[PDB]
């Protein structure tokens, strides 16, 4: 790792965090990149660099070495991360990706919606 | 009536030592090994073991490591047995 | 110290001027004196140090007025 690319830290020894527009499990669509025009659910989030990992997208062959002497290694295919600005939320019942908005409901809970279509994303009790 | 210094009595004993020599010392001398605070004393350690496990202490010997960490040899009376007390803790 | 406790008098910077206008530093000290001064109230002397210019003040205004202006009690 390169010494200067470490995540910048606040005076309280904690890292400086970014604001995102995604969550774990949300279905999205890649805007640009090598995996352009594909859909998948987000598995993990990396707030310190605004990168996200989607299942079965942006994978690379890793040559795992044989830590044990009794056997040899293998060539595993591991998933990598993508910058969140290169993806967009996606809806299945319309097949149209759009940006994100925010609207208050009658109950008083703030939620986000798709601007073009108009559905709600963060339905309650999903984790 | 006063002690020498004032601090947490429950911090006087951090943890025991687990070495082939320490375990060898339990059976030969009826002793026990314990890492202790730098500000500790033989009196507080003698009073300490008397209260935790309810056993008598024949003698206490101590030393300070080069790293600034104090060690404590604790020889119990022959009436009790350090090996029996060792199994109560979990270490042999 | 060479300070007069009563009047605050002290020495000053002064140069010794030669015929060639050469100037070396010096200090014009104060004419301080150790003396026993009478105090009419308690009817006793007091040991202290003051300048001759301050003696004329006590001789004129009286001791109780001078020492009060300086801000000192005679009883120590």
């Amino acid at each position: 790792i390169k010494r200067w690319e470490r995540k910048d830290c606040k005076p309280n020894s904690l890292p400086k965090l970014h604001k995102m527009h995604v969550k774990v499990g949300d279905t999205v669509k890649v805007i640009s990149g090598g995996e352009k025009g594909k859909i998948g659910e987000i598995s993990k989030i990396h707030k310190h660099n605004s990168t996200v990992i989607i299942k079965d997208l942006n994978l690379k062959t890793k040559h795992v070495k044989s830590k044990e002497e009794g056997e040899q290694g293998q060539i595993i295919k591991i998933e990598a991360a993508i910058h969140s600005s290169n993806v967009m939320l996606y809806s299945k019942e319309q097949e149209v990706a759009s940006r994100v908005g925010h609207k208050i409901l009658e109950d008083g809970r703030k939620v986000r919606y798709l601007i073009k279509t108009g559905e709600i994303v963060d339905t309650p009790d999903r984790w | 009536k006063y002690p020498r210094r004032i601090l947490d009595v429950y911090q006087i004993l951090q943890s025991p030592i687990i070495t082939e020599a320490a375990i060898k010392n339990i059976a030969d001398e009826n002793s026990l090994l314990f890492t202790v605070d730098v500000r500790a004393d033989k009196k507080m350690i003698r009073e300490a073991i008397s209260n935790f496990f309810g056993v008598k202490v024949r003698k206490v010997n101590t030393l300070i490591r080069p790293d600034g960490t104090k060690k404590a040899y604790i020889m119990l009376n022959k009436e009790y047995n350090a090996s029996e007390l060792a199994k109560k803790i979990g270490i042999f | 110290r060479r300070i007069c406790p009563f009047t605050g008098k002290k020495s000053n910077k002064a140069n010794r001027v030669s015929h060639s206008n050469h100037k070396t530093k010096r200090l014009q000290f104060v004419n301080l004196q150790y003396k026993r001064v009478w105090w009419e109230a308690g009817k006793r002397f007091v040991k202290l140090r003051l300048s001759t210019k301050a003696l004329k003040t006590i001789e004129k205004n009286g001791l109780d007025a001078v020492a009060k202006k300086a801000g000192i009690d005679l009883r120590k």
Partner: protein, 99 residues
Amino acid sequence: VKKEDELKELRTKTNEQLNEEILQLKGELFMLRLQRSARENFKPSDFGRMRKRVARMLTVKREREIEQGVGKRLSRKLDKAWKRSIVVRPPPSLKKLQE
């Protein structure tokens, strides 16, 4: 969940119940320090569970003295005198285990 109820119970107890309860923890931490050395089955979260539960008690004990009007200089004297008259005892976990 263990934040509104934990503090509420302690704010109702008297000082003596709070005092003696701390002595149980300080000795109970010692058993956890033993299990850490023996590599037995111990929960690392118990170190934080108990260490934080002491601070909540000394926190409330201080606040009750603010009501009485105690200063910082005086409170430290009473804290030391309480440690001068301290006496170690076995924890409950040793009594349930010692047989």
